[PDB]
Amino acid sequence: FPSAVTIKSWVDKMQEDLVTLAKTASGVHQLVDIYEKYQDLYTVEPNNARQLVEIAARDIEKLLSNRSKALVRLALEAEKVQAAHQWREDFASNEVVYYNAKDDLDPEKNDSEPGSQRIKPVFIDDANFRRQVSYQHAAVHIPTDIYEGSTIVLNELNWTSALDDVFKKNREEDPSLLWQVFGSATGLARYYPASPWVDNSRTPNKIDLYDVRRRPWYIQGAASPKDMLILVDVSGSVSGLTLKLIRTSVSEMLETLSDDDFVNVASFNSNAQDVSCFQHLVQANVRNKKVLKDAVNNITAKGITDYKKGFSFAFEQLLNYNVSRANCNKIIMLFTDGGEERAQEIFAKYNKDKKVRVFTFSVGQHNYDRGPIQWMACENKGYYYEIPSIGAIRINTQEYLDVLGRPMVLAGDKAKQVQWTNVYLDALELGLVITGTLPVFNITGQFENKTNLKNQLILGVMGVDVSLEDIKRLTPRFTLCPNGYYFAIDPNGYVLLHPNLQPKPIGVGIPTINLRKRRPNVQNPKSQEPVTLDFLDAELENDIKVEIRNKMIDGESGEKTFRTLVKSQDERYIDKGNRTYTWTPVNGTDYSLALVLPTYSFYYIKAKIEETITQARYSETLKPDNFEESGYTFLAPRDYCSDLKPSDNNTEFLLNFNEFIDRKTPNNPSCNTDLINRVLLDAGFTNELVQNYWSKQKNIKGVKARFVVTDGGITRVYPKEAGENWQENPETYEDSFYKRSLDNDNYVFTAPYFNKSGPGAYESGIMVSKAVEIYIQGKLLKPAVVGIKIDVNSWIENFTKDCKRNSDVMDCVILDDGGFLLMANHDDYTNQIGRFFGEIDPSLMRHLVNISVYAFNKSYDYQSVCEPGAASKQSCITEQTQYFFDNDSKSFSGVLDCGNCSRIFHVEKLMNTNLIFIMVESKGTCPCDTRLLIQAEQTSDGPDPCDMVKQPRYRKGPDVCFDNNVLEDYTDC
Amino acid sequence: MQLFGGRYDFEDTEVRRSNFDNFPQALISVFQVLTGEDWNSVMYNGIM
Ligand SMILES: *[C@@H]1O[C@H](CO)[C@@H](O[C@@H]2O[C@H](CO)[C@@H](O)[C@H](O[C@@H]3O[C@H](CO)[C@@H](O)[C@H](O)[C@H]3NC(C)=O)[C@H]2NC(C)=O)[C@H](O)[C@H]1NC(C)=O
Ligand SMILES: *[C@@H]1O[C@H](CO)[C@@H](O[C@@H]2O[C@H](CO)[C@@H](O[C@@H]3O[C@H](CO)[C@@H](O)[C@H](O)[C@@H]3O)[C@H](O)[C@H]2NC(C)=O)[C@H](O)[C@H]1NC(C)=O
């Protein structure tokens, strides 16, 4: 085994060889030279990240105040309009004309139900809606089990028809506005503009079971947040059909709950235990509810019924005050069949003043006495609900919000506050969106205070979407580098706006569906959960980020600079990036907005080119017939002008881009000058490289392909044969290697993938990249990232000439940080190239981490898909490992032993690059396995919830809670 | 009533109306078996 100085001297002649090959062939110092040679085609402006945040915080203020004004007027009209409605019952005499969504639009149908008359609308196709729509009226959604033509429903479509004039007045004023909808108390919803619903009832074989009342946006503006507590009666009498019904009501009751709502679930049979692991009221987020809905299911009925120990346990649960709580409506609901005891004594003290509200549910078909339960409900200002059937569950476990809304409708105007929802997928397929809601109240005869019998309910709730693609147009990231971004946050820790946030729903648990019990044609529910990713789950968690995260939940302003490690774009690397954060509150709302920058991004380039010939000359550089002397040029699909659209077929896009500058001068009076201009300047900078430097050295021996991925989207792979293999995203702010090249001050090597499809190994090769780094007036800039795809065959020859091909004495390999295998001596390893090195000899890799040579961090990706397990895709959690050098020390000697053998490995790290060289004795001499240490998205179901909630994350609830008005009717059950 | 009352607690959704839960109903069930009418369906419920 060679000495430590021989490995030292032999690494230094093959890290000097790779870097000279990459410093020379790519042209780092040449592209630095021509950014500095000009100085005057551009100027260098600063990103004032105090100022940028303040500017952004105000476009989201004004956007969400403009939405709010529209909401207020609609509400006023609805209140005024229905106070002048006459309650007619002759509807076959005077037809109600409306367009009904989810109905066949074929003219020849002509069903013509009594009372109603439909509309055939004309349906232009649209952008900002990715569906055909009509701007002349509002559609109407009736849920499926609700009959339309009922006097109760027919009378909504009469009075609600005056909203189409106010609907129209909102979009005339603001073209950008998205869905406008009124969700009725009656269960009928009207939205503008009209479009056909996505599931028709019976024209396909999937049938929608969508109810407006059920909806989260409808619920948050229906009522105030609430600490509920479900009691379940588990006595012996319940076992049977009735027990079956209860498990489906509680799961149903929960659907109703929200993050702001706290909830626990207890159960009694002569003792009250608590159904799961929790013991206090927990946040009823997606996870906690998933635990409770998984413990409600396993319940077995046995034993004597005791309503006294069931309501003692409930009240005690209600009084914890140590835990984090909603502290608003306090209510307890019991599911039971029949009661012989009213438990008068427990209610006298625990709730002598009736602070708590009791709702009693009688379920199943049975003969047990319901008088005592009704009495309990009446005594406590709750309500009573029967459920005999499965189809009766859905409208009675949502109906309690008519009771809880009462002291809000007695609060008057004070209760008309806009609230904005958690991001969620739109019913109509719009994408991620948030809705601002306002409740409409039933005011009839207010002038004189004549009735009030049913004047304590809301007419319904009114909402208006903001799409998250509308907010991302108020937070522009182009001046800032790929590293910089804006993050938005609730007072709940959830992230409103984040690079990491994705359309797929956030998943819980490992998905298990039973194929042996799913019928071939019945169509179960798909999903309704909100997409609540948290800030400490969108990014790698620190302790110096939980400080930042708490500090901008409680509405403060500030900046912070620290060293933290960024997870890479692809999930394979972790790079220590020195960042600065800066946050401020959006003053109209409860959102607070932040901005990450990396020091060195504090300055950007603005293009200062305006000459006729110079913008002209740089623009034919990106012509696809002129790639024989330029290099297969790419271009990023920014929204350059409003007219040319991002196309995802890039040769399509670059023609429509470059047609646009010929057919019209780049002045373009409805199109931003700087973004297009910077691109033009850039293409004259990645031209002078490809003309005056790369086309001189037309073939370097080991060099396969040469790229300049730059800022302005223009990536230039140098031979067109090589550009067929360029499998990157052509958007330069989505490339992984672009972003890892900017963090590092040394050449970076990217490992090719293992297996997969497409040619990514011998054909393209392993790639090196390096950020260009210029200084203008003593101000650091990193404009571009040069690079090289390496030839893996040639590199091997230099490497071979104490390691020989087909060696049995000892094997040596080169590994980039992250532990991936790039170059291998054996030839059974270099076939499996770009593979995680702990999968080809897991014994050595395990030891290396122990020596402190390597470090890692497992994280959770709450938005990913996986195949089900037997117990096409669902959402699930994956755990993800990344590996990264944590020790700066250059060399590491030692020996590892498996038991009865030693192997002496020597590790040396090449200077000036992330690569590491290790020499070790052949694996075959000691037959050892430990277990195969693998690095992949690995399906898992963590972290366990029962341990998170003992020390929950900081949170801030709603300031205004409406409950317990003294003059509430409290007489109807 | 001693053999079959309280024992027809099936987690189906079908109705088994000739059962032994009350004394009036139990009484109704015995007279049904004495006519012979659908007496095997009553016996199938008691075996399950
Ligand atoms: C493997 O090792 C070889 C030899 O060191 C290395 O070589 C290429 O080697 C030749 C041998 O002299 C170099 O001349 C050649 O470099 C160029 O010519 C002169 C030499 O001083 C200088 O201008 C630069 O070194 C460089 N510039 C040129 C010619 O444009 C050198 N480079 C190539 C690729 O031909 C291989 O690169 C090593 N294997 C790799 C690529 O890792
Ligand atoms: C709910 O539906 C009823 C029935 O369609 C609507 O009442 C109708 O309202 C219109 C305009 O308010 C009435 O038109 C007026 O008719 C009189 C003659 O009757 C004429 O002198 C006026 O110049 C005008 O043309 C219509 O007659 C009336 N129908 C009845 C039976 O009274 C009502 O408008 C709908 N509510 C909403 C909010 O849309």
Ligand SMILES: *[C@@H]1O[C@H](CO)[C@@H](O[C@@H]2O[C@H](CO)[C@@H](O[C@@H]3O[C@H](CO)[C@@H](O)[C@H](O)[C@@H]3O)[C@H](O)[C@H]2NC(C)=O)[C@H](O)[C@H]1NC(C)=O
């Ligand atoms: C808003 O509140 C008002 C009352 O404050 C509600 O109006 C009431 O609606 C009921 C519906 O059951 C009407 O009662 C019906 O009367 C007819 C006679 O026309 C009778 O045939 C029915 O059997 C039933 O008793 C009642 O007339 C009406 N009250 C008033 C004062 O107009 C209204 O329904 C609420 N708004 C919404 C959208 O529900």
Ligand SMILES: *[C@@H]1O[C@H](CO)[C@@H](O[C@@H]2O[C@H](CO)[C@@H](O)[C@H](O)[C@H]2NC(C)=O)[C@H](O)[C@H]1NC(C)=O
């Ligand atoms: C958000 O609103 C606050 C006030 O509630 C603004 O703070 C003010 O800032 C101005 C100068 O910008 C000072 O003159 C005032 O004294 C500040 N307010 C108070 C009460 O001291 C803040 O600038 C606003 N920020 C944004 C982004 O809109």
Ligand SMILES: *[C@@H]1O[C@H](CO)[C@@H](O[C@@H]2O[C@H](CO)[C@@H](O)[C@H](O)[C@H]2NC(C)=O)[C@H](O)[C@H]1NC(C)=O
């Ligand atoms: C992420 O990895 C880093 C390794 O660099 C961890 O940081 C070290 O954590 C240990 C305890 O696990 C401390 O003793 C060291 O002082 C830390 N070193 C540095 C440089 O921070 C970090 O804990 C990991 N994060 C997680 C969540 O495991």
Ligand SMILES: *[C@@H]1O[C@H](CO)[C@@H](O)[C@H](O)[C@H]1NC(C)=O
């Ligand atoms: C807000 O409304 C005003 C007035 O219609 C308009 O000028 C402005 O552009 C709107 N802002 C946003 C972000 O929609």
Ligand SMILES: *[C@@H]1O[C@H](CO)[C@@H](O)[C@H](O)[C@H]1NC(C)=O
């Ligand atoms: C982080 O900050 C220190 C001190 O300002 C600086 O020396 C270092 O270069 C920064 N980190 C990186 C990766 O540049």
Ligand SMILES: *[C@@H]1O[C@H](CO)[C@@H](O)[C@H](O)[C@H]1NC(C)=O
């Ligand atoms: C290093 O390995 C030793 C022996 O296997 C072990 O006791 C120790 O915990 C390891 N160090 C770390 C950091 O895990």
Ligand SMILES: [Ca+2]
């Ligand atoms: Ca008979």
